[PDB]
């Protein structure tokens, strides 16, 4: 499954993920691609912050979805 | 910010004036913020200039005062018990606004919910409550199996169907289960089209989507959602998020609906 | 006795109970294994939503019986 992460700088990150992946897993995967520590990452989908301890599935995130990444 | 009934106030240049909107850090107060941000954008409630932090108690106190001051549409010396009933049922649900509000969508219209005490809060304030979880008429499978059923009816119907002898029902079960799974983010393309057309230009409204409530408006035939996540607290020019697709691929806009850059 | 509870997700919770247990009591036990609020929880067995004050025995819920947990849509 592929999703997109848009920063405010205007940059688009592509990730390969599963619905069962945790927000913690997704932040690890963003560290891989841009070397940004998970603790400096806040993920948002459709205006609501995605918290650690829940899965992509928990937030109904399907393939080709765009998340927003902020400090 | 950190403690659970504290919110950061964000001041934005709205229509000539520094105007507060409340930001959210954790899940639970979205329904309260969706209403309170409308009252703040309409200047129906005012905060001391550059107040930085507000509590649940303060927001509830302001909202309570607004609800109790609504007058009935038709003025009469007596009766108006139906109106008085709405107000008391609105005052009883008020506290759930900070922790989470139950809704029962029907998939037939952007304004269609089961009428419940929870709905009353928006009705009494004259605030429209919308949703774009609409079954596409061009999927007549879904239209026939989903029907006029509310969400609450449909998940029970799925359970019944799975245990049916009748293969017609088993099949209805599968189509409905498949509707819920493919539209799990609670917004369809058809919903988005119908919502864009039904919403009133310049009007502020509450939008339910993906177990979340947003403040919504329409500018130049386009839908926008107020940005409330505390991660944008410092971004003065990030105020409105475009709603023109179902996959979260949005543009940020300033107070005046002009594209913002970072 | 031991009962099963099927979410729409597909996973299944096992509970220890007595025919004398209230539905409120079983929603309370579910709030542990899965962390969900009782007032969001709806329990279905043989076509009925289970009322809080009723007992397992009131609905003839025997050992190994399967209940269905469906959630209210809650916006946060």
Return the structure tokens found at C31: 């709030």
Resolution stated for this PDB structure, in Å = 2.2
Whether residue B95 sits in one domain with residue B40: yes
Domain of residue B237: give its range: 6-72+79-133+186-253
Burial grade of B121 (CB within 10 A; 0-12, 13-18, 19 or more): buried
Beta strand C66-71 pairing with C2-6:
parallel
Domain A2-70 belongs to what architecture? Roll (3.10)
Whether residue B221 sits in one domain with residue B148: no
Residue corresponding to tokens 């709205």: B14
Domain annotation covers residue B259:
no
Identify which of B212, B235, B249 has the shortest CB distance to residue A48: B212
Domain annotation covers residue B223:
yes
H or E element in which residue B66 lies: helix B56-68
Mutation pick from B99, B156, B161 vs chain C, by most beta carbons of C within 10 Å, is B156
Hey, which residues 36-75 in chain C have their CB within 8 Å of chain B? 39-40, 42, 44, 47, 49, 68, 70, 72-75
H or E element in which residue B168 lies: helix B167-182
- Laid out side by side, the sheet with C66-71 consists of C12-16, C2-6, C66-71, C41-45, C48-49
Enumerate the domain spans of chain C.
2-71
Buried b / exposed e along B151-172 (16+ C-beta atoms within 10 A) = bbebbbbbbebeeeeeeebeeb
**3 state DSSP class of B1:** coil
CATH class name, domain C2-71: alpha beta
Which experiment gave this structure? X-ray
- Residue B218 contacts A where some CB pair is shorter than 8 Å: no
Whether residue B36 sits in one domain with residue B108: yes
Closest CA to B66 of B111, B130, B127: B127
Alpha-carbon distance values, B191 to B92, B108, B204, C1 (Å): 31, 9, 18, 46
- Residue B186 contacts A where some CB pair is shorter than 8 Å: yes
Beta strand B6-14 pairing with B17-22:
antiparallel
**3 state DSSP class of A9:** coil
Identify which of C47, C70, C75 has the shortest CB distance to residue B155: C70
Identify which of A47, A61, A67 has the shortest CB distance to residue B228: A47
Whether residue B159 sits in one domain with residue B47: no
Mutation pick from B155, B215, B228 vs chain C, by most beta carbons of C within 10 Å, is B155
Positions of E strands within chain B = 6-14, 17-22, 53-55, 101-103, 129-131, 204-208, 213-219, 222-226, 240-243, 252-253
Whether residue B156 sits in one domain with residue B88: no
Helices (H), B115-166: 117-124, 140-146, 151-162
Domain annotation covers residue B163:
yes
Beta strand B101-103 pairing with A42-45:
unpaired
> In total, how many domains does chain B have?
2
Touching B: which chains, 3+ CB pairs < 8 A?
A: A, C
């Amino acid at each position: 499954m592929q999703i997109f992460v848009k920063t405010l700088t205007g940059k688009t990150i592509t990730l390969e993920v599963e619905p069962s992946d945790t927000i913690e897993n997704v932040k690890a995967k963003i560290q891989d691609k841009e070397g940004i520590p998970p603790d400096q990452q806040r993920l948002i989908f459709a205006g609501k912050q995605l918290e650690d301890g829940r899965t992509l599935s928990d937030y109904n995130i399907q393939k080709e979805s765009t998340l927003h990444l902020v400090l | 910010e950190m403690e659970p009934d504290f919110y950061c106030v964000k001041w934005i240049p709205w229509k000539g004036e520094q105007t507060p909107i409340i930001t959210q850090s954790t899940n639970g107060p979205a329904p309260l913020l969706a209403i309170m941000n409308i009252l703040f954008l309409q200047w129906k409630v005012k905060l001391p200039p550059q107040k930085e932090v507000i509590t649940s108690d303060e927001l509830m106190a302001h909202l309570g005062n607004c609800l109790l001051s609504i007058k009935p549409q038709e003025k009469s010396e007596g009766l108006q018990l139906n109106f008085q009933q709405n107000v008391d049922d609105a005052m009883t649900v008020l506290p759930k606004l900070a922790t989470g509000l139950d809704v029962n969508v029907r998939f037939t219209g952007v304004s269609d919910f089961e009428y419940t005490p929870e709905c009353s809060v928006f009705d009494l304030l004259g605030i429209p409550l919308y949703h774009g979880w609409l079954v596409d008429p061009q999927s007549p499978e879904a239209v026939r199996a989903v029907g006029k059923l509310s969400y609450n009816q449909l998940v029970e119907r799925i359970i019944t169907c799975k245990h049916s002898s009748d293969t017609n029902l088993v099949t209805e079960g599968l189509i409905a289960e498949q509707f819920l799974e493919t539209t799990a983010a609670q917004l369809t393309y058809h919903g988005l089209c119908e919502l864009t057309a039904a919403a009133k230009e310049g009007e502020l409204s509450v939008f339910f989507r993906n177990n979340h409530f947003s403040t919504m408006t329409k500018h130049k035939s386009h839908l926008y959602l107020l940005v409330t996540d505390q991660g944008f607290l410092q971004e003065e020019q990030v105020v409105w998020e475009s709603l023109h697709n179902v996959d979260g691929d949005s543009c940020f806009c300033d107070s005046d609906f002009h594209l913002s850059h970072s």
